[model samples]
Structures are given as structure tokens and as C-alpha cells.
Target chain A: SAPRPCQAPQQWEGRQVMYQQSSGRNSRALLSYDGLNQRVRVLDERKALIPCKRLFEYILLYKDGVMFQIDQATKQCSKMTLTQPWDPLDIPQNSTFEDQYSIGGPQEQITVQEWSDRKYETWIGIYTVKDCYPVQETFTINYSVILSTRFFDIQLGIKDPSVFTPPSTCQMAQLEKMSEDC
Target chain B: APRPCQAPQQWEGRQVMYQQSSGRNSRALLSYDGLNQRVRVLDERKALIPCKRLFEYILLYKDGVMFQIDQATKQCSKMTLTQPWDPLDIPQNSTFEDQYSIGGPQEQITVQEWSDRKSARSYETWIGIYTVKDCYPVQETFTINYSVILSTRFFDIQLGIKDPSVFTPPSTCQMAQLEKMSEDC
Candidate 1:
């Protein structure tokens, strides 16, 4: 039987390379997931485009509707409760299949499926047909926002089960609020 | 690669949450979540309205829809964001000028300037300045020709969202929601 929601893995850890085409910003992240508990963590790294061109690191934790973000350099933690729960990244449930093709010759073949999730302007997902392993995902809304995320070094099962552990520094994370005066 | 003339500022991030001087009669808080295509603004303006003189206008943009609400009256209006989104989101058509430093070495900040030429005679310019090491913005100026339109000095800026509720509609926005659902009943 085909899973209603096509995705990479339920509980696994992998490296994700993301590109923001609009801003020309590239980032690398170590992504950990636990679909059962609705838990995930991301260790992201990126270089700032400012004059100094400094590198920034971040630790982001999400569970259901809450997020705990800790900046590595500042050792500051902030917790924000979202209005809605994050839908686990998966191919749209009723997305239409667009194309199927192979990347290389018969001997080195990598069969792929391209799907379209057109709810938000335009969205596309590329996955390995055989295992439903996600190769890339892209979506854009009104051309102003564009994002492309690629998965690599993906192995089934969670490698470090403790990857979901929150840092001790976030014990008393500051509860974020709107600025009273600008 | 451009040389590191100044340390990065806190404004450099995936989502920039900051407050800047609005104007003589108003002030504003802005949250630009680029990856999510969301821009939330808490605009407190000193004006005379039907119910009051000062109003907090919360504007939320997401999924191609924009909700404009006044917190006091719970008055809500919705509109679709037009194509190619503007409101200073990635000025693709503007010209980027030279990078320069301002103030003395004892107290210096560096910035990159941008300008949008409306015509040969009328044009607008903007310059953003931030401290060297901490990266907190010291000042930002947006002017039309030579007249200053928006001049801001950032204060107590946290890199990321300190409070999600600050930039998002409240759970108690039911009054605004119920209006649409029960209007025709």
C-alpha cells in the first residue's frame, strides 16, 4: 500500500542543504526528526551577508506548536509558541504527479518522481520512487519567496537518539513578546 | 568577497525582528520572516479614529492574504497581497551603491547604501548603519530627494522573535473570525 503522505523518513537524522534563491543565502543544517512525538531539532549554519561576513550558528527545537531557539554565540534562548503546529515536511497528500525520470544511465540509474503541491502558489517535490527518499523540495509564493532544500547523507533510523535533547542553557529560556515601543 | 570593515549586525538573520523609529506621530515594529513569506507589523499611530485617538494596527501577511486589524475595535479587513510583493521586501529594482563607514574610529559604524530612482529629477535613497562588533543598528535613513521621509534609530533589538504572539494574531482573535462566519446567519 502507498503511504498517503509521501516523505523521506518518519524518524531519522540527516544533513540538509538549503538555498534561498531570492536572498542568495545558502545554509547547512543537521536535521533530527521524531514524527511520532512531533519533535525535531535543527543545527543550522550560515554566513551573514554583512560587511564582516561572519558565520552564525543556531539551534532550533520544535515540538507541536512551540519553538525553542538558542543562539550559539550569545547563549541566549527564546521560546515562542506558534499559532499552528508545523506540518511535518512531506509531499502533499493529494499532490499530482508531474513526471518520472532517471538521472543517469541504466547502470547508474536513480529513478525519481516529481510531484506538484499547488496549494501555495507553486510547490514541487522530488523523491526517489522506489524508497520515497526525498532528494529535493522547492516552493515559491508570488515569486517574492523562494526556497530549495536538498537532503543528503540520509540513512534510515535515528543515529543519535538523544539528538532531540534540549540544551541546558535553555532551562530558563526567555519568553518572547512583542516590542512595546519602537 | 568584500573585506570585513565592520562586525555583522543582529539584523542579519533568516527572520529579522526589530523596532525602528516610525515618525513624528507614530512608531512601528516589524517582523519579516522571509522563508515563510510573512511580514507582521504592529503600527501604533497617534491619530483620531472613530473610537479613540491612538490605535494599534496589526497587519499580518501570509499565504497571499493580508489581514489588517485594529486591536481596540476588533475591526478587521482582509486583502490579497499583489504580485511581486513590495513594502521594501528585497528591492530587486533598486541600485546598490558603495559601502562606507560613518562616524569616527572611536565610534564608527559601516553601512551599505541603496537608491531607487523614480525619474531623472525625483529619486529616493536609503542608508542603514550598524555598530561594528555587536551588529545592532544605530540608525537608518530613507529619504526622497533631500527630504527625510523615514529616519529610524533601532533600540534593544533581539536577533530573533522574543515573543511569537508579538508578530502574530492572538488566539483571542475570534471576534474578528466570528464576524465572517456568522455574518450571514
Candidate 2:
């Protein structure tokens, strides 16, 4: 047997993807990305967030509603929440139909650019639920997996030393798409 | 069917994660906003800070040459070394001929965990929090440089969703042991 020329899984980087792991709690055709095309499961969805004064440029949520933000300048991010957000506590509007995006906790903050550009205000979208197996469903459901530029370390840039490790394997042939359509 | 809970599913904020193949030059895994989507495989080495230290962050050679560290101590400094890339073998006194010393970043944390693929049993067994340095972009302009390196791995693990909810563990803690948990995969 010979090692096949390793072609990385088509980087579905910037394309929004939908995932509905019927077995999981947050099963929906929510927005997600496949950076390495490895964990093609329902990880997170892109959603708008509240305005933070000194921190965070933009805030996005995982399918499970884990809020994340990027620094306005450095764009560096650290995990602020590991658990799920609760109702009444995180839901500012509690509209059921519409909820205002607000930081779940006081200490919870990331450096996000001010809405100074106003472009985000116009282009930003909040997270909406789908109403099939689960109730509060957003009518037109769509997903995308956006790709960002690749960054490496000084050492890794000079030489990729991990030559023996197997390439990233997605095993799509055996696995079924969460949507049951793929 | 279980009456669908009348609540929206959600989780805590993002825990940034990254992965870099030992042999790959400067190509560290960078995920924006700690969100898994739209990751960039760039040729830049940005600082990555773990949230905790349970993760045993280290870059070990397939032959066991330890390089790069997210956590540091006197013992860890001795293990850091640059060597040819290979699948790192388990710590061995008989086979590990090269002198083991530790170096690399001293404050980051990497994670590992227990898995049972057949049962879909999984958890965030390890937790590490770190504050990276000099991670600011090269320039303050429209396009900023963002990079992250992880000591632990997450994309590979399967979801750990327990049915009865009673059998599920509330906290995420690494069992610290790799068992052939399930054979019927």
C-alpha cells in the first residue's frame, strides 16, 4: 500500500455550514465553520452581540450560544465562558420573539471594535432559532463556514517538522451530515 | 419523545484552541474569536494563552524531543528541545535515549482527555487558562495579524452527550488515563 497524495479536505472556510445533530442538545441548521474541515459537527453559529465599550470588535455565538468576541486591535481572544448562557440572566429583552444581544456576565468581556464603522450595525445579524423539531425556528435557515488567513509560528514557518503525523482526516464517507440532506 | 425543553440551548464563552503539526513550519492553527469556524492556517506564530493549567502543553517530537511549553516549572524547562518531527511515543525509560529537557513558552496550558467513541462519551477533561504576550497584530490597520497555538487538542474528540442526564458528569475533568474504553467502534 502507498500513502495517497494528501489533499486537505476542501477548506469550507468562509462558507456557512448547517449542522443538526439530532442526538445533541443544540441540534439545528445553525451557522458554523470548518477551519480544518475536521470537526464538521455543529460547533457554533455567527450571531450579533451587544456593544462593549472598551473591549471586543464583534461577538459571535456557537450553536450552543457560547458568546465569543475578538479584540478590536490585536484580534486576540480568550475563552470567557465554558458553560451555557441562561435565560432571564442573559436574555436582555426576553422577547421570545426577539432578544437583545448583551454580555452574559459583568466580568465577561472581549475587545471588540466600537460600532464606530456602523458597517457592522448594518451588516450584523443576531442568532435565531429554527422551529422544526425545536420550536422557536427562524424562517429562512442558512449556514456559512468562513475561512480566515492562515498564521504560523516562527519555528513552524521555517520548517514543518510534523511530517510523520497523519493528515487531518474528516471521515465524511462514514459520517452523515447533521442535516440528513447531505 | 421527551417534551422538548422550552428553552434555547447555549454555552459559556469561547475557550480559544489551536493546533500545529510539529514538522509544519510556523503553521500554527489559528481560530478567530475562539469560534471554530473560518480558521486560518497562516505562517505566523501568535501567542496563545490557555484559561487553566490542567493541560500539559508541550511540543514533543515523534521520537519524544519535547519542544514548546504553555506551562512551565523547573522540570518542564528541561523537556523543551527542537528535533525532527515524528509521532511522539509515550514516555519510556527504555526507548527514550535523548536527554529530556523542557523549554518554550512558560505560561500556557494544553489539554488531553478520555474518550469513548462508541458511546459518544466525551468531556473537557482538561482546562488551562493563559495570557499570551506580544500577540498584537503586526500593524494597526484594516488587516490585523491574529495567531494562536494550543497545547491541547479538541477538534478530534467526539461529543459527550449523556441521555439519562443522571449518568452525565456535571463538571469537565480529565480522567488522566487513556483506556481502551470501547472496542466495538
Candidate 3:
């Protein structure tokens, strides 16, 4: 498939509309749109209209020739696989992680994310271990870390960028004074 | 909105992602998703996937909201809130957080994302100043504090829940056998 520019909301949801599943990171994400900046949201596959004022954030983790699309909003995910796949022969037995450890400064709160064609990898699990900022005697913050293992090999798509985008409408607002509304 | 790019540099801190507009001295959180190429909103809500790490120490300036998401792999989140919304939104700044998710314990890395919008009170804005780091793994009887830079006045928030899809774990281990097992098991 030819490469396409990254379009927000619709682009992500459109892929679902056409059900165009391609094995790629950059090229495959492109979807067909109806030509307006504002998504109709009337389309079936792309119909969920959670509101947002800004762009959406995505984390695509790839490993063993597989891709996992992590939506920052809805916190939902999708998966895809490529030519060379990494099918684990065995699931790791270790389940528990030690909570106590030597702490690092705010500088240690460095979060890193990465991507590629055959695979995409983000430090979703590691960031939770590294503290973000404010080196104080008693500081605390809690969150969930999404690892590739849990999500496994599947293509997950999520709408509702407002989770990360500010000025969430909760409901999709009219894109423009529609010809009817006007 | 595109962030100032001045604050992170002025504070001697590199901008983690683009900045969201600041509301009344309250800063919103921001995070970068290389996979998508666009900046994103970071929240403690399970409705949306939180950042992929755990927070060790957090510093808030005033009483507002703090957003943090964890990786879905090892960490699991837990809490008791009046309503189902994002994980934690402090009414004041100068705050810190520490907790583990219901998931596993690999490294427990934490990512902190914050931003600020006008009094209109929307989750609107680009993300800015996101930090990821390794911290103590989650444990019981431990306290996670969010330091307040200022104080809390009034703020609105929402919590999170898992997607209706993933929550329903597959019933059968295999298709053919699982189909039969579905009837019996």
C-alpha cells in the first residue's frame, strides 16, 4: 500500500471503517477519509466520537515481527504482525515485581518511546519504574504499566483522543455550524 | 495548542513533549508517543491506557490535577475514589504519588504527564513536561504523596475503567476444544 499522511481521529478510526489491515507501522496506519477535517462520525467502524481539542497520542509496540497499537485515550489497544514473528514458546513464570528499590532523581523520570516497520517498542513498562520528578523525602504516584505480554499479538484501535487531548467535549460537538444547524 | 518550549528549557528541563496551555497557574501533563508521531494526553484513568510506568516521586505546584498512565505489561493500578474517573487529580500542586497496579512487577517505571487549560475546565491542551524514571516497586502499606506547589480550590475530574473488550478474557484456551469446554466449563 502507498504511504499516506497522518490524519487524526478519522485516520485512526477510518482504518477500522475500511477494515484495511496492513502489516506495517507507518504505511499501514493510513486510512481513507471523506475529505473534511471534521470526521462525520456517522460511519459505522469509525463512529465512536469521544471529543478532543488537540492531537491524539499513540504508542505502537512491536516485537517478534508483531505490532501493538496503544491508544492513549480510551487506553485501548490493537495488534498486528509482520513477516518474521516472535511467538513465545513459553510464557514467563515470574509474575511479581519488587516494589522497594534505590530511588533516582526526577531526571530518572525519563520516558522513552520507539517505532519501526516490522515492529514497534515503547518503554511503557519501564517508565512506571522510573520516577518522574520532584525529589522529595516523601513522594508518591501510582499508575498501570502495559506490557506487550499482557496485550499479546493482536491489532487494537482506540478512539477518544480527549483522554490525552485537553478540552474534552465528552460528547462530539458539531464540527461546524452544519448547513442544517446554520 | 503548541507549548511555549521556554518553560522546560528555563527550568533546565528538556520538554518531554509539546506543552498544553496553562490554566490559572495549574499545569496539565503531557507525553510523547513516538508510534503515533503526535503528542498526547496522559491520565490516570483506566478508561484510557495510562503511561507505561510507575511514579516514585511527584512534585505539584498548586492544587490541581496530576495525570499518570502505566504500561499495560507489569503494573496494575488500584484506588478508592468517589466517582470513576482518572487515577488521581490533586486539588493542589506540590504533590507526590506512589502505588502499584493490579498487574505484575517487572521494573515498575513511571511516567508523569500534566498540563493546564483555562477555567472552561476541559481536558483540552497539548501535553508538556513528561518525565519517565525507575522507582521503588509497588508494595502494601506504602504512602504515595503529591506535593502541592500551591493549594486546591475547585477542580473536576473523571476516573477510568478497562475497555469492555479486553476485560472479558477469552473463555476457551483453544477454538475447537474451547468451544466444547465453553459448554461444560
Give the candidate number with the greatest lDDT.
Answer: 1
Q: Candidates' DockQ values?
A: 0.01, 0.01, 0.03
Q: Give the runs in model 2 whose Cα sits over 4 Å from its true position.
A: A1-15, A19-182, B1-15, B18-64, B67-74, B77-185
Better of 1 and 2 by DockQ: 2
Ranking of predictions according to lDDT:
1, 3, 2
How would you order the candidates by TM-score, starting with the best?
A: 1, 3, 2
Q: What does candidate 2 score in Cα RMSD to the true structure?
A: 25.6
TM accuracy, model 3: 0.19
What's model 3's lDDT at A123?
Answer: 19
The segments of candidate 3 whose C-alpha lies over 4 angstroms from its true place after superposition are A1-84, A87-182, B1-10, B13-112, B115-124, B128-185
Error of 1 at B7 (Å): 41
Writing each residue's lDDT as its tens digit, candidate 1 over B1-185 gives 33223322212111112111221223345554444455565554322221223223344445555665665555665555565433432144555544433321222234444444434455555545433333344445555544445554333344555555655555444344423211111
Q: What is the DockQ of candidate 3?
A: 0.03
lDDT of 3 by residue, B13-127 (tens): 1111111111111113323222222222332222223332332111121222222223232222222122222211222221232121211123223433233321234332221
For residues A59-154, write the lDDT of model 3, one tens digit per residue.
Answer: 222222333333334433333434443322111223122122222124331222111111122111211123211111111123211112111111
lDDT of 1 at B125: 54
Q: Write the per-residue lDDT of candidate 2 for residues A81-160, one digit (tens) a residue.
A: 32543311011221222122221112221211111111211111222121001101111111111111111110101122
